[PDB]
Amino acid sequence: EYQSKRLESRLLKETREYVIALPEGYAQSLEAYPVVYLLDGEDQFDHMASLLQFLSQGTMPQIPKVIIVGIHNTNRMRDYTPTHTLVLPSGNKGNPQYQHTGGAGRFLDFIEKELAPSIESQLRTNGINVLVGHSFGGLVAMEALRTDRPLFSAYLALDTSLWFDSPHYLTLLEERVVKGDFKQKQLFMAIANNPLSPGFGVSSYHKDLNLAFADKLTKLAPKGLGFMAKYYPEETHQSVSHIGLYDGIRHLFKDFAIDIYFSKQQVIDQYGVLSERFGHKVTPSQQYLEQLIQYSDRQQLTERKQMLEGLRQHFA
Amino acid sequence: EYQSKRLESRLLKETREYVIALPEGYAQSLEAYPVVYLLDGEDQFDHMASLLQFLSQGTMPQIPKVIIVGIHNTNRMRDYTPTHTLVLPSGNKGNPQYQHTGGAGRFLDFIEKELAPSIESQLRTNGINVLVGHSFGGLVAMEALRTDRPLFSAYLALDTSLWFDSPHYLTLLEERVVKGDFKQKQLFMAIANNPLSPGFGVSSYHKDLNLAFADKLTKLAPKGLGFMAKYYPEETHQSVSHIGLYDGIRHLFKDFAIDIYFSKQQVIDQYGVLSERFGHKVTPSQQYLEQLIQYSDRQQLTERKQMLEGLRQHFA
Numbered sequence: 001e002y003q004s005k006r007l008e009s010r011l012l013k014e015t016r017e018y019v020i021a022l023p024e025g026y027a028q029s030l031e032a033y034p035v036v037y038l039l040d041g042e043d044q045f046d047h048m049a050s051l052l053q054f055l056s057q058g059t060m061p062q063i064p065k066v067i068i069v070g071i072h073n074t075n076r077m078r079d080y081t082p083t084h085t086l087v088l089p090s091g092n093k094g095n096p097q098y099q100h101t102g103g104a105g106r107f108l109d110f111i112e113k114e115l116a117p118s119i120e121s122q123l124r125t126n127g128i129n130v131l132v133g134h135s136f137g138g139l140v141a142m143e144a145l146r147t148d149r150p151l152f153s154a155y156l157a158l159d160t161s162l163w164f165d166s167p168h169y170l171t172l173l174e175e176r177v178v179k180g181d182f183k184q185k186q187l188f189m190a191i192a193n194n195p196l197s198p199g200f201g202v203s204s205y206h207k208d209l210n211l212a213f214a215d216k217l218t219k220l221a222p223k224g225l226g227f228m229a230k231y232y233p234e235e236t237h238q239s240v241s242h243i244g245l246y247d248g249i250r251h252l253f254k255d256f257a258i259d260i261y262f263s264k265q266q267v268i269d270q271y272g273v274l275s276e277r278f279g280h281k282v283t284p285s286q287q288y289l290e291q292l293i294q295y296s297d298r299q300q301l302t303e304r305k306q307m308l309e310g311l312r313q314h315f316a
Numbered sequence: 317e318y319q320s321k322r323l324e325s326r327l328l329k330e331t332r333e334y335v336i337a338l339p340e341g342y343a344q345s346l347e348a349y350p351v352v353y354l355l356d357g358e359d360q361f362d363h364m365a366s367l368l369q370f371l372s373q374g375t376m377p378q379i380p381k382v383i384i385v386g387i388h389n390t391n392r393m394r395d396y397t398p399t400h401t402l403v404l405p406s407g408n409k410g411n412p413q414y415q416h417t418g419g420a421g422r423f424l425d426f427i428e429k430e431l432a433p434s435i436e437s438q439l440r441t442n443g444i445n446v447l448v449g450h451s452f453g454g455l456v457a458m459e460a461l462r463t464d465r466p467l468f469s470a471y472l473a474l475d476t477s478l479w480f481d482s483p484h485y486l487t488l489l490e491e492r493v494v495k496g497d498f499k500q501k502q503l504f505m506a507i508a509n510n511p512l513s514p515g516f517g518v519s520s521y522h523k524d525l526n527l528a529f530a531d532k533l534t535k536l537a538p539k540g541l542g543f544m545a546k547y548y549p550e551e552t553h554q555s556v557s558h559i560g561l562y563d564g565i566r567h568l569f570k571d572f573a574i575d576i577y578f579s580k581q582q583v584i585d586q587y588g589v590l591s592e593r594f595g596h597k598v599t600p601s602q603q604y605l606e607q608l609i610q611y612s613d614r615q616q617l618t619e620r621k622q623m624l625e626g627l628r629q630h631f632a
């Protein structure tokens with residue numbers, strides 16, 4: 001269940017369409033939620049949104065409730081590439097739409113100055129914003145991190161097209177990593193085993209770039225960046241967007257869970273750690289605490305019911 | 317994008333609702349597809365159907381195209397329970413809808429005698445039918461296998477509620493396993509790590525029933541049954557429906573992929589093995605072959621195009 005919306009971009013000089021999925025229970029309180037921005041909305045929103053909602057529903061949600069925003073494309077080669085090139089890594093000319101490359105900076109300015117402000121004005125957001133980009137969308141994610149964009153706390157880069165304008169762009173990326181000292185950011189990379197690489201046909205060049213880059217991040221361990229990568233040998237470039245999101249989003253929010261099987265102070269301290277990791281206050285979801293109190297209340301479960309009440313009162 | 321359907325069940329003496337998702341390209345050829353029947357359609361169809369369609373789209377599909385049938389419930393405790401009992405495993409009374417338990421036989425009859433014939437008279441189906449049951453729906457899968465229902469060749473049992481009417485029902489299942497000699501059947505079990513077991517509270521009783529039955533199937537190795545189980549320690553009883561189908565359906569269709577990087581006969585033999593495994597004729601998807609020939613055709617690929625075209629003719 002989504003809303004279909006439009007925004008006139010004065011920056012990009014065109015109409016921009018997007019889709020919003022509100023979390024179940026949204027209308028029933030003043031709870032503010034995180035926002036997961038999804039690139040390639042037209043292609044990826046349906047399967048990604050349905051997964052995100054499945055993971056957050058039930059009595060034992062695996063991730064918290066989130067607002068989902070799917071961003072639709074107009075000129076993808078312009079908006080998703082951070083640098084300009086007319087050629088593939090082979091030196092051979094890319095398709096005619098390569099003439100438009102190099103506008104990721106401007107597209108990001110649309111997200112931060114036009115889209116996000118509009119979203120945050122319309123809905124109750126909690127200051128935690130996630131960006132999910134697959135393929136070229138991954139370069140938007142890498143470029144947001146590279147340019148120290150303040151909006152996003154966490155990035156999921158699913159089989160990023162790092163081969164694009166390589167070695168030039170990749171070199172800029174590496175140099176940001178070496179400089180390090182990130183503003184409490186998080187990065188997750190899903191790496192697939194695609195047998196092809198654009199410009200080369202049957203080759204592992206695309207894959208090898210991702211694996212080498214992930215290895216360098218791990219080896220350099222820049223300060224202020226939570227990083228994790230997963231290699232999927234049985235996935236392809238396109239098929240990895242679903243499982244990559246699965247594992248990346250579950251990883252991102254794994255420590256938000258409160259296992260009722262434990263004390264009030266343990267929960268406060270755990271959310272303190274999450275607040276410092278995200279670089280923004282993070283408090284347990286009001287809905288989530290109400291369920292726990294219901295699972296306790298309904299099941300006569302210990303002082304736990306009462307620990308959960310005070311804990312609800314703490315963050316009130 | 318589904319089709320909302322209705323069938324007057326003479327057997328069940330009620331109106332039965334269901335949803336159909338046709339594979340992409342359906343209207344474009346005379347190709348016949350397998351049918352994946354999903355139980356608990358009201359709650360599970362949306363995320364399962366989006367995953368299934370996602371896994372079979374693109375130039376390197378992970379599973380073949382299928383017809384997805386989601387079956388909605390009316391009286392779930394009546395239709396999803398193979399035996400009748402008014403009590404939980406603890407001996408305490410179940411909720412008042414326990415009085416209707418034991419109708420899984422008739423609900424399966426509904427599928428074979430009314431629903432499947434109706435689907436098959438309306439759509440181009442290829443003889444390969446798969447049943448996906450989660451929780452209590454997992455018990456329907458078990459009973460279909462237990463009572464040798466001829467319609468289905470493969471079953472996905474996702475965190476089966478084996479605790480229901482235990483130890484009685486479970487013993488009936490075990491008796492069937494020992495008797496073995498299945499008629500080229502397939503069973504996949506997903507086993508989650510839920511901290512609760514109905515009627516027991518915090519208890520691994522439900523999980524233990526699953527793990528021990530899987531161990532029994534593995535050790536006993538009944539003739540004529542391809543079996544595999546996967547345990548998910550980071551999943552709950554409800555959350556495992558998704559990743560359980562993900563891995564289950566991928567495992568079922570794993571050997572259907574043709575890597576053209578190989579001979580006409582290698583695929584003939586490959587499909588001979590699949591046919592013997594499903595106990596029914598299995599042939600490469602017409603769309604899939606056409607995808608392979610056009611890639612080959614595009615990439616000036618040897619007489620691989622010719623080999624594939626050779627394959628194309630053999631199965632015509």
Ligand SMILES: [Cl-]
Nearest residue numbers: 148181182183
């Ligand atoms: Cl930063």
Ligand SMILES: [Cl-]
Nearest residue numbers: 464497498499
């Ligand atoms: Cl049999």
